[PDB]
Design an enzyme around this catalytic site. Sequence first.
Site, short mmCIF file in Angstrom:
data_model
loop_
_atom_site.label_atom_id
_atom_site.label_comp_id
_atom_site.label_asym_id
_atom_site.label_seq_id
_atom_site.Cartn_x
_atom_site.Cartn_y
_atom_site.Cartn_z
N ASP A 25 74.06 32.54 59.58
CA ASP A 25 73.58 31.32 58.95
C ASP A 25 72.06 31.22 59.05
O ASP A 25 71.52 30.67 60.01
CB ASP A 25 74.28 30.13 59.62
N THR A 26 71.36 31.70 58.01
CA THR A 26 69.90 31.70 58.08
C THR A 26 69.30 30.30 57.96
O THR A 26 68.14 30.10 58.32
CB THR A 26 69.31 32.60 56.99
N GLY A 27 70.07 29.34 57.48
CA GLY A 27 69.64 27.96 57.44
C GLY A 27 69.82 27.19 58.73
O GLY A 27 69.48 26.00 58.79
C1 LIG Z 1 79.59 24.87 57.01
C2 LIG Z 1 78.55 25.84 57.59
C3 LIG Z 1 77.11 25.23 57.60
C4 LIG Z 1 77.02 24.03 58.61
C5 LIG Z 1 77.44 24.49 60.02
C6 LIG Z 1 76.76 24.72 56.20
N1 LIG Z 1 75.35 24.16 56.11
C7 LIG Z 1 74.29 25.17 55.81
C8 LIG Z 1 73.44 25.39 57.15
O1 LIG Z 1 72.55 26.38 57.01
C9 LIG Z 1 72.68 24.10 57.45
C10 LIG Z 1 71.50 23.89 56.50
C11 LIG Z 1 70.65 22.66 57.07
C12 LIG Z 1 69.32 22.89 57.76
C13 LIG Z 1 68.52 21.71 58.31
C14 LIG Z 1 69.05 20.28 58.13
C15 LIG Z 1 70.36 20.04 57.43
C16 LIG Z 1 71.17 21.22 56.89
N2 LIG Z 1 72.13 24.29 58.80
C17 LIG Z 1 72.56 23.57 60.02
O2 LIG Z 1 73.34 22.72 60.02
O3 LIG Z 1 71.90 24.00 61.19
C18 LIG Z 1 71.99 23.11 62.28
C19 LIG Z 1 72.23 24.06 63.54
O4 LIG Z 1 70.73 24.57 63.73
C20 LIG Z 1 69.90 23.53 63.42
O5 LIG Z 1 68.90 23.93 62.66
C21 LIG Z 1 69.12 23.27 61.22
C22 LIG Z 1 70.14 22.12 61.45
C23 LIG Z 1 70.84 22.46 62.56
S1 LIG Z 1 75.18 22.69 55.24
O6 LIG Z 1 73.77 22.34 55.09
O7 LIG Z 1 75.89 21.63 55.91
C24 LIG Z 1 75.92 23.05 53.63
C25 LIG Z 1 75.06 23.60 52.50
C26 LIG Z 1 75.75 23.89 51.16
C27 LIG Z 1 77.31 23.64 51.01
C28 LIG Z 1 78.12 23.12 52.13
C29 LIG Z 1 77.44 22.79 53.48
O8 LIG Z 1 79.34 23.00 51.76
C30 LIG Z 1 79.45 23.70 50.40
O9 LIG Z 1 78.18 23.83 49.91
#
Ligand SMILES: CCC(CC)CN(C[C@@H](O)[C@H](Cc1ccccc1)NC(=O)O[C@H]1CO[C@H]2OCC[C@H]21)S(=O)(=O)c1ccc2c(c1)OCO2
EC number: 3.4.23.16
Lengths: 99, 99
Positions: A25-27
Site C-alpha cells: 500500500d504505497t498510499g
Molecule cells: C482498503 C485498503 C486501504 C485502507 C487500509 C484503502 N485506502 C488507500 C490507502 O492507501 C489510504 C490512502 C489515504 C492516505 C492518507 C489519508 C487518507 C487515505 N492510506 C491509509 O489509510 O493509510 C493510513 C495508514 O498509514 C497512514 O498513512 C496514510 C493514512 C494512514 S483508502 O484511501 O481508504 C481507499 C482509496 C480508493 C478506494 C477504496 C479505499 O475503496 C475502493 O476504492
Amino acid sequence: PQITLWKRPLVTIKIGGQLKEALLDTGADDTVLEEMNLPGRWKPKMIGGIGGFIKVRQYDQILIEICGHKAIGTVLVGPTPVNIIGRNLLTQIGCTLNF
Amino acid sequence: PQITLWKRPLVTIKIGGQLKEALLDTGADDTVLEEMNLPGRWKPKMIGGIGGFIKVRQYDQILIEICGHKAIGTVLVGPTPVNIIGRNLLTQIGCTLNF
Ligand SMILES: CCC(CC)CN(C[C@@H](O)[C@H](Cc1ccccc1)NC(=O)O[C@H]1CO[C@H]2OCC[C@H]21)S(=O)(=O)c1ccc2c(c1)OCO2
C-alpha cells in the site's frame, strides 16, 4: 519482482511466526494489521484514514518477512479493513514505483 | 520515472482543467479526488478504509493526465483528505511496483 496493478498487490508476509496475506500500500505511511497477538510491549496510538481515526496498538521494532525480504520496524494493530504494508516497511525492502 | 517511497508518492495531475497533487496509491482500487464541482452525470458510491466509509460521487470516462501520461476512467469525488490515484488509472500509465 515487478508487480503489475491489474489485481490487488497482495503478498504473503510472516510476522510473529505466522503467515498472513497483506496489501502492498504505497498510499499508507504506516503498516497496519488486523487484530492479532504480537509479542513485546506496545503503546496506544491513533491513526487516520479516509473515513476517520482509529485506535491501534503500536509495536516497535517488529520483524516482518515480506515475500522473502526482511524488514524490522513499527507495526500497528487495530481495526483496519485489510492488512496493509505501508511505506515504513516498503522502503526497507527496496520497493519503488515505476512508470 | 522511478519514485522511491521515503516520502509520500505525490505527483502532479491534470483533471477537469485543474492541476492537483495526488498520491500514486497501490492500495486504492479506485481513484478518489478531493471535493470538486465537475460537470456531467454521476452515481453515488460508498468506499471504505481506515476509520470507516465516505460517500462519494462516481464520474465515468474522466480524463486525468498523470505526470504527462494520459489516462481515462472512473473517478470518485468526495470528502477525502488526499487526492488518490488508484489502480484503475495506475495500470493505464504502466505503473508497477518493483523490489
Ligand atoms: C482498503 C485498503 C486501504 C485502507 C487500509 C484503502 N485506502 C488507500 C490507502 O492507501 C489510504 C490512502 C489515504 C492516505 C492518507 C489519508 C487518507 C487515505 N492510506 C491509509 O489509510 O493509510 C493510513 C495508514 O498509514 C497512514 O498513512 C496514510 C493514512 C494512514 S483508502 O484511501 O481508504 C481507499 C482509496 C480508493 C478506494 C477504496 C479505499 O475503496 C475502493 O476504492
